[PDB]
Design a protein around this ligand. Structure first.
Ligand SMILES: NCCn1nc(-c2ccnc(-c3cnc4ccccc4c3)c2)cc1C(=O)O
Length: 264
């Protein structure tokens, strides 16, 4: 009988429990500040919203999704006044490693593992009927600069509850597709009309980036970047796909991604 706790929105001053600093760890809707837990002294990330109903949706949905290992954990949520302005302050696990591609710029097998982790993130969300939507790289961060460090998904501002016929997340699978692409070659499939080339499904696999790359991956990216959503791959299928399912038995084929990101 495994029952996790509910969302306690603490009403007391946040400054009673943490010391809020200035250092901004990200801007994204509303700066994200680094703060320290008075009791433990661990670093945490604080997100501050105006207490409207959209903002209570983010909290709710993030919180529900927080148990997933590859989704930035929420540690507590506060309702405070601030210049006569009711607010939702979210406290999250501090992901020190920084943004996915920054860390890149410093192999196929490595590509896969990263993609696996991001899949589990979506798999979880989908299995509890949450679409994330805004699954860009800017919202994919590592827990530490350490190489074993693990990749976790953030930012639920655009997340939405989806709640087989007689019983929206399709676009998360697009994001995955795109994120896969960039990991391999090092640049988007739709370089800068770009809006008109996306609607056509108009992208190449130009060499030398994609010369050494597998047909197995190609066809997977292809299914992920299908223009028509209903044609596009499901999360469940994605995770059953051998390339993703078997990261322990995948090619260690080198790609010049770090080179390209440092380039552009
Ligand atoms: N993705 C940008 C916006 N955004 N960033 C965060 C976030 C959450 C947790 N940790 C960080 C974080 C912490 N330390 C860092 C140190 C260096 C570089 C980036 C860092 C990012 C950032 C949350 C949100 C959000 O939920 O809106």
């Amino acid at each position: 009988f495994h029952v996790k706790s509910g969302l306690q929105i603490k009403k007391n001053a946040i400054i009673d429990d943490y010391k809020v600093t200035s250092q901004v760890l990200g801007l994204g809707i509303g700066k994200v500040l680094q703060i320290f837990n008075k009791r433990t002294q661990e670093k945490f990330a604080l997100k501050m919203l105006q207490d409207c109903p959209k903002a209570r949706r983010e909290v709710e949905l993030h919180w529900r999704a927080s148990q997933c290992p590859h989704i930035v954990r929420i540690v507590d949520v506060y309702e405070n006044l601030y210049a006569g302005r009711k607010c939702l302050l979210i406290v999250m696990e501090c992901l020190d490693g920084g943004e996915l591609f920054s860390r890149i710029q410093d192999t196929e097998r490595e590509a896969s593992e990263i993609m696996k982790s991001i899949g589990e993130a979506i798999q979880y969300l989908h299995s509890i009927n949450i679409a994330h939507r805004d699954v860009k790289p800017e919202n994919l961060l590592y827990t530490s600069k350490r190489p074993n460090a693990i990749l976790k998904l953030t930012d639920f501002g655009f997340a939405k509850e989806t709640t087989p016929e007689v019983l929206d997340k399709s676009c998360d699978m697009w994001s995955l597709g795109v994120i896969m692409y960039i990991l391999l070659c090092g640049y988007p499939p739709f370089y800068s009309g770009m809006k008109t080339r996306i609607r056509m499904g108009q992208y190449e696999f130009p060499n030398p980036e994609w010369s050494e790359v597998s047909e197995e991956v190609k066809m997977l990216i292809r299914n992920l970047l299908k223009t028509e959503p209903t044609q596009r791959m499901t999360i469940t299928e994605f995770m059953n796909h051998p390339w993703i399912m078997q990261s322990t038995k995948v090619p260690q084929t080198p790609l010049h991604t770090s080179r390209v990101l440092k380039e552009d």
